[PDB]
Every structure is written in structure tokens, then in C-alpha cells.
Amino acid sequence: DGKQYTTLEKPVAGAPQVLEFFSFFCPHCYQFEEVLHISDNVKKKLPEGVKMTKYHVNFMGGDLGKDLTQAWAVAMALGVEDKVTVPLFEGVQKTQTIRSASDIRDVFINAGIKGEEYDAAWNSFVVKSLVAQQEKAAADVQLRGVPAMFVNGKYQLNPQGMDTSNMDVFVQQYADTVKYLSEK
Ligand SMILES: C[C@H](CCC(=O)NCCS(=O)(=O)O)[C@H]1CC[C@H]2[C@@H]3[C@H](O)C[C@@H]4C[C@H](O)CC[C@]4(C)[C@H]3C[C@H](O)[C@]12C
């Protein structure tokens, strides 16, 4: 109990069944996703049909981070989030070329989203709604750190209890825990 997850006292309404919070500015999130590939390994183990979604957070990267949350909404709106995840992480943390909102847009353009399509999405209702969802879900759990993962809007993963002597075992322990939780 509490070893691999905790139960929220107030469940999150409208949350993706498997919800990962992250920041492109967060080095740990980069380790979590681009080295451990947690979400990929979780997805492989999830029951068929279960939605896993990543939500961006606003509390890193200054006001640019908030723009990135909106760009991430654009990505989800356009269905390119999986693709742009890598160049956004790399642009922020590796090449350090994401220093303004136009640099974010450039990543999308280079990923094949025309500037005009990005801008129209940026200003669209679907994007505003996705931004509202990301911000509301973070508020609903009083999120103070990333990465974090929540299942069924009810269960918060606790990686602290998990054995880290072997990264492969850690990843599968974590993925197994998510699957178990998703089936509750
Ligand atoms: C920064 C993360 C915790 C952030 C946080 O406080 N989130 C909210 C609370 S909770 O978590 O959701 O409960 C921690 C949790 C698990 C950690 C990871 C795991 O320990 C597995 C490896 C261990 C390696 O030594 C470093 C990379 C890493 C991939 C760790 C990076 C970072 O320290 C993580 C990602």
C-alpha cells in the first residue's frame, strides 16, 4: 500500500485513462520518455483500447513553457504529438534552440505542419479546450512535479517504491503497475 501508487481523494474528471504529466524543459522527463521510453512501454502493456495521453505543464520554462503547453495542445489537436515529442525535447534540451514561441512553431514546420496550419490551430477552439484540459488536470491533482502519471483519474503512480537496480526491471514494474491500475 502506497508502495507503487496512491489513491487520490478527489478523482480527476475527464482525464485520459492513463495521463502522464511532463515538461519539455524537464531533464528527468527527457530521461523518463526518451531513455526509459516509459509511455511506450506502458502502452505496450496497457489493455487494448486504453487511452494514454501526455499533458504538458506550465511550471517550467517560464512563460515559454506555457506557450509549449499550447503548442502541445496544437500537436494533440493535429495528431502529431508522437512525432513532435522528440524534436521538441531535443530543441529544448539538446540543441537549446527553443527560446521563443517562434522556435516552437519552427519545430512544427520542420515536422511538416505548415505555419498557416499551426497558427490556425493555435488560435482554434479545440486547442483552447486542450489547454484548458491540461491546466485543469494539473490543478485537480495540485501537481508540483513532473513527470507524474495518473490512472483512471484516481491513482497516482509512485515510482519511489520500485526497484531501480535494473532499469529494464524498473520500466516493467512501472508498466505492470499502470496496467494493473488501468484494469481497476
Ligand atoms: C523526477 C521524478 C519525480 C518527479 C515528481 O516529484 N513527480 C510528482 C510526484 S510523483 O512522482 O508523481 O509521485 C523522478 C521519479 C522517478 C525518477 C526516475 C527513476 O528513478 C528511474 C531513473 C533513475 C535514474 O537514476 C535517473 C533517471 C530515472 C528515469 C529517474 C529520473 C527522476 O529522478 C524520476 C523521473
Q: Is there a contact between 10 and 159 (Cβ–Cβ < 8 Å)?
A: no
Q: Degrees (nearest 5) of the Cα angle 23, 13, 143?
A: 30
Parent domain of 36: 1-184
Give the separation between CA 95 and CA 26, rounded to whole angstroms: 14
Query: Are 12 and 137 contacting, i.e. CB atoms less than 8 angstroms apart?
Result: yes
Alpha helices in 3-61 (DSSP H): 27-30, 38-45
Structural domains counted in the chain: 1
Whole-number Cα distances in Å, 110 to 24, 84, 88, 91, 133: 18, 9, 11, 12, 27
Residue bearing the CA closest to ligand 1, atom 11: 148
C-alpha cell belonging to residue 178: 499502470
Q: Are 21 and 38 in contact (CB under 8 A)?
A: no
Neighbouring C-beta atoms of residue 145, cutoff 10 Å: 12
Name the residue of 3, 18, 30, 32 to mutate for ligand 1: max ligand atoms within 8 A of Cβ.
32
119 and 85 Cβ atoms separated by less than 8 Å: no
Bridge partner list, 149? 20
Ligand 1 site, residue 31, Cβ cutoff 6 A: yes
| Closest ligand 1 atom number to CA of residue 170 | 21
Nearest residue (by CA) to ligand 1, atom 30, is 28
Contact by Cβ (8 Å): 22, 32: yes
Task: For residue 130, give the nearest of 30, 61, 53, 65 by alpha carbon.
Answer: 53
User: CA 136 from chain center: how many Å?
Assistant: 14
Q: Is 77 near ligand 1, meaning CB less than 6 Å away? A: no
Give the closest residue to 69 by CA, choosing from 104, 28, 115.
Answer: 104
Longest CA–CA separation in the chain, Å: 50
User: How many residues are present in the chain?
Assistant: 184
Closest CA to 21 of 134, 159, 128: 134
Instruction: Report the alpha-carbon distance of residue 61 to residue 54 in Å, rounded.
Output: 17
If you ran DSSP here, which 8-state letter would residue 47 be given?
Answer: P
C-alpha cell at 74: 496544437
* Resolution of the model in angstroms: 1.8
* Amino acid symbol at 156: Q
- Say if ligand 1 is within 6 A of residue 18 CB: no
